[PDB]
Amino acid sequence: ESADLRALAKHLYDSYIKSFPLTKAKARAILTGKTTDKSPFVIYDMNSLMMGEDKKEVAIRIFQGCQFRSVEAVQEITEYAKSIPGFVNLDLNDQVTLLKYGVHEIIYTMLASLMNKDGVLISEGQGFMTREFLKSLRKPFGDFMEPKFEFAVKFNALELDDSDLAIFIAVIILSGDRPGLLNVKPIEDIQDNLLQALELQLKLNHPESSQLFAKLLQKMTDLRQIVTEHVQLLQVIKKTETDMSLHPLLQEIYKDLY
Amino acid sequence: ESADLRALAKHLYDSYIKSFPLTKAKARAILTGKTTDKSPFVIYDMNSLMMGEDKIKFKHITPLQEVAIRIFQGCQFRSVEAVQEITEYAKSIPGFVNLDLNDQVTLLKYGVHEIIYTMLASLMNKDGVLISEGQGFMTREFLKSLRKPFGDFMEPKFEFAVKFNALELDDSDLAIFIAVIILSGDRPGLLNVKPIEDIQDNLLQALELQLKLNHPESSQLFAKLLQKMTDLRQIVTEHVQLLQVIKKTELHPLLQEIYKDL
Ligand SMILES: O=S(=O)(Nc1ccc(Sc2nc3cc(Cl)ccc3s2)c(Cl)c1)c1ccc(C(F)(F)F)cc1Cl
Ligand SMILES: O=S(=O)(Nc1ccc(Sc2nc3cc(Cl)ccc3s2)c(Cl)c1)c1ccc(C(F)(F)F)cc1Cl
Numbered sequence A: 001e002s003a004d005l006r007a008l009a010k011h012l013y014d015s016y017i018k019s020f021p022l023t024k025a026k027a028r029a030i031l032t033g034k035t036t037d038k039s040p041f042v043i044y045d046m047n048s049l050m051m052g053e054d055k056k057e058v059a060i061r062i063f064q065g066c067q068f069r070s071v072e073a074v075q076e077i078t079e080y081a082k083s084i085p086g087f088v089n090l091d092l093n094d095q096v097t098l099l100k101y102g103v104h105e106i107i108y109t110m111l112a113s114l115m116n117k118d119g120v121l122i123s124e125g126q127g128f129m130t131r132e133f134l135k136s137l138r139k140p141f142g143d144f145m146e147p148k149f150e151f152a153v154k155f156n157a158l159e160l161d162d163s164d165l166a167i168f169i170a171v172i173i174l175s176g177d178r179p180g181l182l183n184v185k186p187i188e189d190i191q192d193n194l195l196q197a198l199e200l201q202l203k204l205n206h207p208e209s210s211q212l213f214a215k216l217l218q219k220m221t222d223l224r225q226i227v228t229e230h231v232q233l234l235q236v237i238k239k240t241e242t243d244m245s246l247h248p249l250l251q252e253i254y255k256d257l258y
Numbered sequence B: 001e002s003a004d005l006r007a008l009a010k011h012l013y014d015s016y017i018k019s020f021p022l023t024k025a026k027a028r029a030i031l032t033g034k035t036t037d038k039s040p041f042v043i044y045d046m047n048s049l050m051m052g053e054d055k056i057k058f059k060h061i062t063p064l065q066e067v068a069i070r071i072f073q074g075c076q077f078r079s080v081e082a083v084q085e086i087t088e089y090a091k092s093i094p095g096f097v098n099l100d101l102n103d104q105v106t107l108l109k110y111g112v113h114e115i116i117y118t119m120l121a122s123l124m125n126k127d128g129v130l131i132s133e134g135q136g137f138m139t140r141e142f143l144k145s146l147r148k149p150f151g152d153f154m155e156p157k158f159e160f161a162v163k164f165n166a167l168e169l170d171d172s173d174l175a176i177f178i179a180v181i182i183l184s185g186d187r188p189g190l191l192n193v194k195p196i197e198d199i200q201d202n203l204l205q206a207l208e209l210q211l212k213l214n215h216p217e218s219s220q221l222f223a224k225l226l227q228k229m230t231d232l233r234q235i236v237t238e239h240v241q242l243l244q245v246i247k248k249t250e251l252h253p254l255l256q257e258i259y260k261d262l
């Protein structure tokens, strides 16, 4: 059945490339040292932030940035989702349910690709905001990304590439344990096919990294935690920033995440 | 090597049997009614609680002196007994005692909760849980009928158990699974993660070979099981959220010293 699980991985890797413009391979090239052609502008203080304003207050504008991009992220993830075999064939309501709870877990997973212990790529790689600058922002804004860094650091630790992430992302989506799913069996039969394909994929692409499959699935707790904490932070600004205004798409996702 | 993995499983199984008298197989015999042994006193409401208190041994796990509070205390006591059993089982996991003394303390401090509810699932069915070595059976509704916040404590655990038992795992599977949980190299404060994750790998291969041979008809049981580790961490986190609600809205100092964790 290998031929089937390998062909499946092959298909997901393909859709993943067609759905996500900024892959890990590209982010790493910019973060390592291809440079010259891909060299990023860095923001580490209010000074450079201003000089880099060519690519409300500061914290609010940076936040406004994230939301717009997440919205964009949701769009891509939705597109990738309809490519996972069996997904569009499931009950419409559950498709929506899988997306509402899968989106943030996937966003921070892929966001790890653009991070390193020191910062994160922004504006499609055009820029790079240091971890410290972000942390100096007035709270609760300065407390938004730190947990993501902690996660990204431990997660990138696995040294996964895009083809692995392709399947892993698929697995996060087809989670039968989401709140409200009407039909759980059908969703789980798909995941069993994905988890299977992931394990094989991880054993073939990383023949030296022992129990990578088991180590990867264990990162789910970190994702869930980061997501919950995020949802909390959103509440604070929801009360302290009554003129914030959230995108409707994000408003629907945050509906019951608290 | 396959012979080593098969050996480690048997070893952990024998060790598990020694550390835990009330096995899952035996627990299921009592539940399904398929046993010649005395049926457990059922606690379905207050009246029966005060009733079967004698044979239920609720006087031995409770101070000299209301219900909700008293059942909660019973839980703590059984939990502490569990910790010791888990702690002795740890010693039997190859390499465990050879680790830094601090990491052992750490692995156990953060591991016991996950393992308690995992094992507790072996004494539960959709309607309730076996108690006191099987001499009792407290129903799910009675616990849920308890006043707030106490009635919110066990419900989450039932939802988990019902899904967990669907995996139809046996004591031989559970043994390796438990060990896997204890040897988690991602616990806060570990000083030397290398040897710890090295042991988990061994336990993970042993667990996977064990699942494949004992559950051939079950695809990805291994993966599915690993996912349950996520459900457990969730259950422990919520648990703490409820506990804090207690410490805030609540005694004997010396007694609290025994139950200063669980
Ligand atoms: O909780 S956040 O970490 N969310 C958040 C949301 C979207 C993006 S952008 C972003 N870019 C990509 C690119 C790819 Cl290829 C995949 C996923 C993403 S997510 C970023 Cl960098 C952060 C966050 C950090 C800092 C702030 C602020 F600076 F405003 F305080 C707000 C948020 Cl929401
Ligand atoms: O994709 S983003 O590059 N969008 C984004 C959105 C607004 C501003 S701030 C900004 N403020 C001004 C003010 C003037 Cl008068 C002119 C130009 C600009 S650009 C910045 Cl620096 C970035 C981005 C940056 C940083 C993060 C995060 F902080 F989360 F890491 C996320 C994103 Cl999406």
Ligand SMILES: O=S(=O)(Nc1ccc(Sc2nc3cc(Cl)ccc3s2)c(Cl)c1)c1ccc(C(F)(F)F)cc1Cl
Pocket: B056, B057, B058, B068, B071, B072, B073, B074, B075, B076, B078, B079, B120, B129, B131, B132, B143, B146, B149, B150, B151, B152, B153, B154, B157, B239
């Ligand atoms: O998080 S818990 O699910 N852990 C937990 C820990 C040990 C046992 S065993 C247990 N054995 C006995 C025996 C007697 Cl005679 C009386 C009460 C109990 S509770 C059980 Cl059933 C649950 C829990 C459930 C319910 C309550 C309370 F009823 F107080 F609300 C508290 C906890 Cl901690």
